[PDB]
């Protein structure tokens, strides 16, 4: 796995609702959040595709 | 909003929401034809929706309008969440009515202790996702600029200050950056950020809107 596939999804600090997806490591699934819009880390993908090809 | 209430219906005319596919943040309305925003909601195509209440049970009176100019405070830092503030020209004025009018700007900076009004369809749980549809408000007092430094080192700079409960459980949250703090029938703050929601010791961080009462009325002069 790239290591950061197995980063705890981070919504950072900024307060925007920036919809992304992120590979959850408990469902093995890719899922929607919030993205704030800084910060945060690389477990953040636009589309569901790109989660699903990194992860 | 967490640890607030539900706002009346149309109580806030001043504040709208950003949209591009879905509802992201939320802005005021400062002139007929101008809203305030932070700019860490910036993208390059937003629909401004006014008068609004229940954000997905439209009643037919709301205001929807493009932005025609989205534009950032030039010194704002993505990193550092320096100077968070954004203005939008949308592309036609709104219609002033009883739910869609301004909120004025500041003629004084916030002073410690005031009680200002926070509002937005952020979420609702510190610990949890609950994204309301209906507008939420939460009051809260202006805190001290040394129990804002206190709870966030090295990270607050002139264009910042906190609102909220060093206790915890009343914050502002997600989807309601670029919101509005009004205190005294004045725009003081813009929903910026935070270290989680509500959480002890971590108050919401906003941008002190009085800084750029120049740079606004520059800004709205130089685009008309």
């Known amino acids: 796995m790239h290591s950061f596939c197995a980063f705890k999804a981070d919504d950072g600090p900024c307060r925007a609702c ?35 090809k990194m992860c | ?26 802005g005021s309305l400062i002139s007929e034809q101008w809203v305030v925003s932070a700019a860490h909601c910036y993208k390059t195509r937003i629909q401004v929706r006014l008068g609004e209440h ?56 916030p002073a410690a202790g005031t009680e200002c009004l926070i509002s937005g369809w952020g979420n609702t749980l510190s610990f949890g996702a609950d994204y309301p549809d209906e507008l939420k408000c939460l009051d809260a007092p202006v805190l001290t600029q040394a129990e804002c430094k206190a709870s966030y080192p090295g990270k607050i700079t002139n264009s910042m200050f906190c609102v909220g409960f060093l206790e915890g459980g009343k914050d502002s ?28 010791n971590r108050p919401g961080v906003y941008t002190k809107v009085y800084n750029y009462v120049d740079w606004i009325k520059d800004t709205i002069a130089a685009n008309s």
Request: charged share 20%; hydrophobic share 30%; net charge neutral.
């Open chain 1, 18 to 52: 920036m919809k992304r997806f992120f590979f959850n490591i408990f469902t093995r699934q890719c899922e929607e959040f919030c993205y704030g819009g800084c910060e945060g880390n690389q477990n953040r993908f636009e589309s569901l595709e790109e989660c699903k």
């Open chain 2, 1 to 26: 909003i967490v640890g607030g209430y539900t706002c009346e219906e149309n109580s806030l005319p001043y504040q709208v929401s950003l949209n591009s596919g879905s509802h992201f943040c939320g």
């Open chain 2, 54 to 109: 229940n954000i997905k049970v439209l009643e037919g009176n709301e205001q929807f309008i493009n932005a025609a100019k989205i534009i950032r405070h030039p010194k704002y830092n993505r990193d550092t969440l320096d100077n968070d503030i954004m203005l939008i020209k949308l592309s036609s004025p709104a219609v002033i009515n009883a739910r869609v009018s301004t909120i004025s700007l500041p003629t004084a900076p």
């Open chain 2, 173 to 200: 949250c997600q989807r309601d950056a670029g919101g509005p703090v009004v205190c005294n029938g004045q725009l003081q703050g813009v929903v910026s950020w935070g270290h989680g929601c509500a959480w002890k």
